[PDB]
Every structure is written in structure tokens, then in C-alpha cells.
Amino acid sequence: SMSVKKPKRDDSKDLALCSMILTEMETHEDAWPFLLPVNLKLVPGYKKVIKKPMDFSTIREKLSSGQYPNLETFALDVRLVFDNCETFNEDDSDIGRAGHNMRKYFEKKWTDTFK
Ligand SMILES: Oc1ccnc2ccccc12
Hints:
It is found in: Nucleus. The protein is 57% helix and 0% strand. The protein is mainly α.
């Protein structure tokens, strides 16, 4: 509360570390469904069903332009990519399995890096 501060976790390397994690996700062989925005003009249903589209290139642009106020807002967008994927794809489909794999990949990097 006012004039009562909790000890400050060092966040000086957060930007660099999130960038490294994102690079690792960008270069994963199962990242191909998530590299660019889904084409809303070519994929029936996507625009109406998925209220907040998100993809790696969009996360990269936001990270590079100071649009994440902290590391948790970055993690929220990454998870949104995989949440959208689960909403729109069957678990037993190529894209569906890719999403599950990528989420697992991300969360271990996240824990190992920050927890
Ligand atoms: O859910 C998806 C993620 C990435 N690409 C997609 C392409 C077509 C239909 C769904 C997709």
C-alpha cells in the first residue's frame, strides 16, 4: 500500500528473454500455422468465431514496438494463439496437434526462464 513496497523483482532482462523465447517458437518446425495472421478473407468462419486473432508475427511487432507493458501481457498473447487454435481445430488434426505441441514447448521455456 501507500509507502509500503514489496521487494522488487528484477525485470531488466524481461524484454530480451521474451524475445529469445519468441525466436525459439518462431523456429520450431511445428510453428508454421502460427507465423502469420490467419487470412480472414480465405478462411470461412474464422472472423466471426475467433474474436481476438493473434499470431507470432503480430506478437513480434508488438514486442519490438513497446506494446507489452510487462512479461505477463506477452504471455497472454502467446497463450491466445494456442487458445484460438484449440477453439477452431480438432485435437486430431495437423494444426490441432501443432498447437498442443507449441503450447507445451512455450510453457516449459516460460517456467524455466522466469520461475
Ligand atoms: O486455426 C488456424 C491456425 C492457423 N492457420 C489456419 C489456417 C486455416 C484454418 C485454421 C487455421
